[PDB]
Swiss-Prot record:
Its main location: periplasm. It comes from Escherichia coli (strain K12). Class C beta-lactamase which confers resistance to penicillins and cephalosporins. Has benzylpenicillin- and cephaloridine-hydrolyzing activity. Has weak cefuroxime, cefotaxime, cefoxitin and oxacillin-hydrolyzing activities. Changing residue 67 to I: Increases activity about 200-fold with respect to cefotaxime. Reduces activity about 8-fold with respect to cephalothin. Reduces thermodynamic stability. The class C beta-lactamase family has a specific amino-acid numbering system known as SANC, for structural alignment-based numbering of class C beta-lactamases, or else the simpler name structural position. A multiple sequence alignment was used to derive a consensus sequence and then the consensus was numbered taking into account insertions and deletions. This allows use of identical numbers, e.g. for active site residues, despite differences in protein length. Changing residue 286 to A: Reduces binding affinity of inhibitor compound 1 about 17-fold. This is Beta-lactamase. A beta-lactam binds at residues 61, 117, 147, 149, 315, 340.
Length: 358
């Protein structure tokens, strides 16, 4: 642990924890490709369990990065194409508003106004069909971006259909296992419960509740070690031996749409490096991140740019996570916390750390 990294991380994260009253936090910095780990505070306040490198945190929407890469892997396998109509994989989806809505639109939140959340009322699979059949777009496909669990969540479910695997089985066998993410889970097994941190929301210990398309949109739990390895794999996909997964990673960092200075990937979001920190910091606030914005199609998509800030924020009711990396500098960070605290604080801290190391 070079003193520079120690000092930079501690000087930034200590005040963040104090200001945001975060109960527990783990941070990994990837510097010249190698990970360095830092932990603070409590996984479980009541039982006095500390955060360790083995603590599992809810990733919330950082999960979308795994879904985007798994979709990418399915494209690379020749199982799906992003240009395919959604109805090719869900023939029961016969309502006319779906004409012209492709898997690309689903993956990138550009289908025309699919809502942020699947309604809590949608419990059964027939409920889910009804919901999509009845949904009315506000906009033509590929014209506006509206960040949405119901959009990429459906992409993930459809993407694994030709494999015949459940979403969880496909994720395990095709992404987690080959990458040796052996402490990353969609459903935490009983053996790992001792490591599963509680999230804290208004002082109450909470875990994410089951919901439709949860696995696909926000349901991954992982350790800081596995998340560092996830960043390493995304920094350098060519080191990955499994050909379709290497390609999948590359596809997820391709640039499909532009809004303002951000580019939409599959799960990942990207900006040119060097970035303007106000732009990524203010841009991460849900006031902008969850807003409806016109998009410019990137025709054809630009392949993964190495000089990019690639990142994703994610939260559940009790957790707040952030991952960011810059391929061309072999530099990244993962910040996992068991409080959902404001995005701009996460991105500010990440930028202060990476900027100092870059």
């Amino acid at each position: 642990a070079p003193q520079q990294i120690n000092d930079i991380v501690h000087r930034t994260i200590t005040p963040l924890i104090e200001q945001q009253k975060i109960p527990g936090m783990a941070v990994a910095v990837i510097y010249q490709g190698k990970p360095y780990y830092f932990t603070w505070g409590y996984a479980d306040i009541a039982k006095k369990q500390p955060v360790t490198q083995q603590t599992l945190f809810e990733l919330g929407s950082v999960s979308k990065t795994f879904t985007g890469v798994l979709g990418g892997d399915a494209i690379a396998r020749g199982e799906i194409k992003l240009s395919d109509p959604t109805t090719k994989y869900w023939p029961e989806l016969t309502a006319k508003q779906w004409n012209g809505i492709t898997l690309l639109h689903l993956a990138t939140y550009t289908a025309g106004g699919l809502p942020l959340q699947v309604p809590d009322e949608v419990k059964s699979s027939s409920d889910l069909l009804r919901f999509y059949q009845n949904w009315q777009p506000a906009w033509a496909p590929g014209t506006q971006r509206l960040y949405a669990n119901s959009s990429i969540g459906l992409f993930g479910a459809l993407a694994v259909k030709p494999s015949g695997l459940s979403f969880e089985q496909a994720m395990q066998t095709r992404v987690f296992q080959p990458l040796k993410l052996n402490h990353t889970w969609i459903n935490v097994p009983p053996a790992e419960e001792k490591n599963y941190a509680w999230g804290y929301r208004e002082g109450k210990a909470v875990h994410v509740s089951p919901g439709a398309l949860d696995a696909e949109a926000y349901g991954v739990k992982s350790t800081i070690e596995d998340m560092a390895r996830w960043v390493q794999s995304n920094l350098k996909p060519l080191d990955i031996n499994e050909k379709t997964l290497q390609q999948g990673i590359q596809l997820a960092q391709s640039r499909y749409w532009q809004t303002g200075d951000m580019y939409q990937g599959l799960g990942w979001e990207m900006l040119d490096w060097p970035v303007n920190p106000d732009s990524i910091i203010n841009g991460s606030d849900n006031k902008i991140a969850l807003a409806a914005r016109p998009v410019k199609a990137i025709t054809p998509p630009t392949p993964a740019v190495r000089a990019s800030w690639v990142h994703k924020t994610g939260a559940t009711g009790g957790f707040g996570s952030y991952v960011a990396f810059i391929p061309e500098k072999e530099l990244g960070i993962v910040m996992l916390a068991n409080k959902n605290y404001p995005n701009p604080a996460r991105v500010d801290a990440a930028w202060q750390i990476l900027n100092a190391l870059q």
